[PDB]
Symmetry: D2
Subunit: 291 residues, 4 copies
């Protein structure tokens, strides 16, 4: 029951670069009203790795108050530290999330057994909550094999895989091996093809501003209308082309700001602000997205 | 016109590792008979890089004798040398090939300007036959950006792109930018996803043994049947899974040998033969494909 | 002045994985008696990325107390967050460290301008403490170009460069570009060769158990005895071969345990233990080194 | 006896991209007069992959003549094809080269066993000429491991390893593993550092224009004169900085042309000519090296 299209939620900050709880709530609700299946909180999109545990715990608690019960809630608990992740797993359980998730610990090179044991501990602290292994080689630097992916995916307590890899041959091998697994397409740029390959849903950050399109693609493919599915995917990619230019997290926040959801569309440094030149296309996209 | 499902033809050798003209002829006809749209001859799959210009021309001449007029024939003409490719480009024209193609020159790191001049020179020697740019970063080690690809793909004389890359985001950006470009999906394993992304056909090695499945996936997607489309792709993927264990060229030749097409299923040295342990699966594969 | 052989400090944890101050202080002094030029604390080798800010500061203060004045002190102060880094920089200043240091912010891809501004923000917070730029592409996933490294190394405040790259062509290019730059060779396996190419020192994790060898090579190259230098470098590589085999941080902590310096040779999870099969090897290693 | 500093010979071509035999010989003698220990011919530097077997045989044959056991002669015989490599190996013996060499076969991914069988066959064809395994990850795209290098290096017939890798930890480990192995440093930019790590000599393209500098680093380190060892290395690097800017092969041919050694400073396409803007630097460089 975790299958679906879930927005990878952004965390709005104020001018002092501190959570803008008023905008977070405004964002949780915005996402809900756009027909998303659930929320993935505290992930890469949420600038989790540029945050503290207490900060991430705080974001966790606020979205649960805002959305527990309404949609499916998945907490990204991943830290490079196991002990740190368990803490977050523990709070996630306590706040009432539906599932837990974690990136493959990065920076320090870890053997695969260390990767399995890391997931085990987090699964343990999660206290019953199904785990969503989070695979993103491009940012984590962790290049898992198919067998390793199969081993992790079959670990007790693991209930899903978040595949942020544009390797669609592996996406289907995974599906062929595990017909019942909940597989989320991590790269928005290839959503439609990802589903055709074996994905039964997705978790992506561009959903925040246009989740209905992704859900639209789900219906189109479900009704054998690949013609509109494709149309939706290019529309989604025209956006992604732009966001990749302006910077994705900050560009999404600028759009959301023009949508009157986010007060201050800032990301935390190292990130800088959007180049002013991009502001008009973003303003424009916000207005146009209001469809 | 050049759109469609083209099989990247293998080249059959004998015990002496010399060309097996008879098996080659059998292979062309087998592909034709299996309803393929055309043939991509002398590419990686044809073991071009382990044979000489003459050996390469000889193959172009033979398949032209056999296939010309009955299906599209694209001659893979590239070498590291512009001079060698120009010579091959000239022969493909002489033999009556429909288009010409060439990988981005490898081993030596060439600039992008040098890559463009290589293509212009070859196109020039193609004297009319359209050029299909062959992009396979995984083998050539030439990592082109989307801009470079757009420039190449728009070079006067270029009719198509053979995208051998699994980046289906790029596959659609290329399409978004060249709505009329003939786009070939290079990786069979993602054929259905690559078409949904923007590819309008494909060129590949496994098409030699189960090409009808690819034609099938094409029609299904056309008639909005994603069920058989996906069904078709997974059945292609289990074959590809095996061939990837056994060796694709040698594995495909071995199945062909069992379908009574190829006399000796050996590739050229340094390729070693298929591991005996894999034969039970290969024969069995040849059987089911023969049955379907 | 900041030139020299500087050991990258390991942080000794207890059975409960909490800082082992007894062993820390013991390791500080152990390193001092080894005749090391100073200590690089809170870096990759100190498990910085699996500790919290406070934990990192605590460690910072204890070594400052233990070695301030006795030897040169450089505080690795970097995180992915510029703000976290600044805070630790501000603390390094307070505790009286000699210089500040920071890896290029990893995980999220940051623009070169972003990286430059990040070092700038930390430099500001270092309140007069020179910045030692930390180049470790293998782990950070950040591959700067020469011109980029050149810009970085010349930022107002940057005093040296820790080059953790085996590119000894770029090493001589850096020394050629900057004849007065404090250039630290970051990979112990090529120390001797790093110095012949331009580094005027080095910061290594293995220096903790055999720092004298590294000072040995230095003297030999200075006296023109490359024969002994080479002999010293092959000796260090036999050790390094093993550590990579057993796991470097964990292996080192184990040798230091048999050297009665560290109580429990544990690294924090996700890291795992040393396989028992290596203890006689590591045991014999501690015996020969102390011999 | 294969240990030493040996120049990776360039192959001069005329205005029409054909071999310039006169300049080849002129280039051989020049290198000889430069006190180089021997020559490596037909390698990457010699633009082999842009030549035909017979073209490579021609080059081999002309330098063997010129080379008349005046210096050590090593023939890079490798191609992707084992059979092509064998023929070349068999010609090299026929010409009287002192050893044979070969890169790890590229483009198509091969297994370690396929690589081991490859070398053996070639070794087999060399008929007594030892094999200098040629390792260049950057170009071949083949990532051998130390244990793989060890296996190859101990393979009967293998007498040397040409280490074109910047990994000086691995260079140290190979020397450690093989105290008596002829280990040639492949990257001139780190010659001094590679020797300190265990390389006992080198094979390089820039040796063509300043082989005496590398002979000087060798002597300097021998006499423990690290001070001059470093000046020689930075002087070599200042040069390489430029060559990388212009194109190494072409920059070299350009300096050699200015030294009236090479008639036409061209590389076969797809290599383009040197940017006119760099001539002032190459003109001056040819001057100081000459003046030197």
């Amino acid at each position: 029951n975790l299958r679906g299209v879930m927005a990878a939620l952004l965390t709005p900050f104020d001018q002092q670069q501190a959570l803008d709880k008023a905008s977070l709530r405004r964002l949780v609700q915005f996402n809900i009203q756009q027909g998303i299946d659930g929320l993935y909180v505290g992930g890469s999109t949420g600038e989790a790795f540029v945050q503290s545990l207490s900060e991430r715990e705080q974001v966790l608690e606020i979205v649960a108050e805002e959305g527990k019960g309404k949609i499916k809630l998945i907490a990204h608990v991943g830290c490079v530290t196991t002990a740190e992740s368990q803490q977050l797993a523990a709070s996630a359980k306590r706040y009432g999330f539906d599932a837990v998730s974690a990136v493959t610990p990065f920076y320090y090179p870890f053997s695969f057994e260390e990767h399995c044991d890391h997931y085990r501990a987090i699964i343990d602290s999660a206290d019953g909550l199904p785990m969503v292994v989070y695979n993103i080689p491009a940012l984590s630097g962790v290049k898992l094999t198919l067998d390793q992916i199969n081993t992790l995916v079959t670990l007790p307590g693991v209930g899903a895989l978040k595949q942020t890899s544009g390797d669609l041959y592996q996406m289907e091998q995974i599906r062929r091996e595990h017909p019942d697994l909940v597989l989320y397409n991590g790269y928005d740029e290839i959503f439609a093809s990802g589903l055709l390959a074996g994905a039964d849903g997705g978790i992506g950050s561009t959903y925040n501003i246009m989740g209905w399109r992704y859900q639209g693609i789900v219906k189109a493919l479900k009704e054998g209308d690949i013609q509109t599915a494709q149309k939706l995917q290019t529309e989604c990619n025209k956006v992604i082309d732009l966001l990749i230019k302006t910077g994705v997290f900050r560009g999404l926040k600028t759009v959301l700001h023009y949508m009157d959801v986010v007060s201050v569309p800032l990301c935390r440094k190292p990130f800088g602000p959007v180049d002013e030149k991009y502001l008009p296309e973003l303003k424009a996209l916000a207005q146009q997205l209001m469809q």
